[PDB]
Structure 1
Amino acid sequence: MKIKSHDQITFPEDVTVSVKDRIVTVKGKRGTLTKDLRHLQLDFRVNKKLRTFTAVRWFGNKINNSTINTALSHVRNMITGVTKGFRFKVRFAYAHFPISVTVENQLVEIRNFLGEKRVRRQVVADDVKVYRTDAALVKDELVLEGNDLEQVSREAAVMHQLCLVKKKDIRKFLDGIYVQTKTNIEVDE
């Protein structure tokens, strides 16, 4: 056996984080967002109590070394939601057949596809919030936003997968409801 070791966490600034357990509890502007990690524990060492946290390893295996990054980033992104949130833009896109999506709020209702077939419905999970916006030339547009990209995204990606089609060629297929901007709610501090 060859030493990686295990441990905990890297850091930036204005947002509190757990620093303890498998679980990072990140707290900032937009609240607090927290995740529990499995085998993802790794050479921590606090560099400042409040001001510097890293986890950038001593020895171990190849596979180990990757994770370290993947770990920071994601929790960084825990910070991101907590700070500047996520805002996904989607637009329904269709040409031969018009397509309509509303938002119940608690759930998203999707109409029309190909004359409509089934009604695609997605319940609005927590903090992915959904807006059909339309003025300002907001346009066939859904907006998913909240302070967890992964969720905002997951729900989103899910949506792209909710607008799938089969049988009788991608070379005539396009139409569906596609991701148009995955972002933050804004720039924020």
Structure 2
Amino acid sequence: MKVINSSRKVQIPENVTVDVKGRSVKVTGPRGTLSKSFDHASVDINLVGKKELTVDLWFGNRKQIACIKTITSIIENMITGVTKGYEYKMRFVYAHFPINVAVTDGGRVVEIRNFFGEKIVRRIELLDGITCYRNEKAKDEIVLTGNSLELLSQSCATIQLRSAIKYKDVRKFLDGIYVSERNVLESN
């Protein structure tokens, strides 16, 4: 009926900092100052020491408690990002009409020229805080690195979606951009 919730928590090492002034948090580290907001299902959170961070909740549902974990997870992810960047190494595939993707960083946009004979550009603006390099082996692989897991990943997904055909079979063309390795973290 009411089954009583409790606090999960997250550990913050001594190359990174955290503020939280009004149930909204900005973790900071060597990469940058990555931010995400909370308080929205009456979700109470408080910092105890420069080492722990805790999200307290002791009166609610299963539903309420579900939120608590998620928030914690998100903050952990953010922390990780701030320590060292989330990497999304995609790989594309075609050589009948070789898939040709180009980019600008700073403006942070990716554009797809040739794609299943598409003579258009498919420009897609990446969110802020996403870089893109590419040690290509045989006209394959783009990488997108970024700090906020949540945003970089989203951007990647968008890109993937853009490299897709909406008509005819999917076992016909097995081509487009495809994320080979997500949840990857560079060695610092």
Smaller-chain TM-score bracket: 0.7 to 0.9
Determine the structure 1 residue equivalent to 2:49.
Answer: 49
Determine the structure 2 residue equivalent to 1:93.
Answer: 93
Q: Given that residues 87 and 145 in structure 1 are in contact (C-alpha distance below 8 angstroms), is that contact kept between their aligned partners in structure 2?
A: yes
The separation in 2 between residues aligned to 1:169 and 1:92, in whole angstroms, is: 18
Matched, 1:125 2:127: yes
One-letter code aligned to 1:20: K
Query: CA shift at 1:23, angstroms?
Result: 1.0
Which residues of structure 1 form unaligned runs of 5+? none
Deviates most, 36-45 or 146-155: 36-45
Q: Given that residues 103 and 131 in structure 1 are in contact (C-alpha distance below 8 angstroms), is that contact kept between their aligned partners in structure 2?
A: no
The separation in 2 between residues aligned to 1:52 and 1:138, in whole angstroms, is: 46
Determine the structure 2 residue equivalent to 1:30.
Answer: 31
The separation in 2 between residues aligned to 1:139 and 1:182, in whole angstroms, is: 20
Secondary structure at 1:10's aligned position in 2?
strand
Deviates most, 169-178 or 96-105: 96-105
The separation in 1 between residues aligned to 2:145 and 2:126, in whole angstroms, is: 11
Which residues of structure 2 form unaligned runs of 5+? none
**Identity over the aligned pairs, expressed in percent?**
46
| 4+ residue runs over 3 A deviation | 1-5, 43-46
Determine the structure 2 residue equivalent to 1:172.
Answer: 172
Pick closer, same or farther for the CA change 1:40–1:76 going to 2, 3 Å: farther
Aligned residues: 183
The separation in 2 between residues aligned to 1:45 and 1:121, in whole angstroms, is: 42
Pick closer, same or farther for the CA change 1:148–1:138 going to 2, 3 Å: farther
Q: Given that residues 81 and 147 in structure 1 are in contact (C-alpha distance below 8 angstroms), is that contact kept between their aligned partners in structure 2?
A: yes
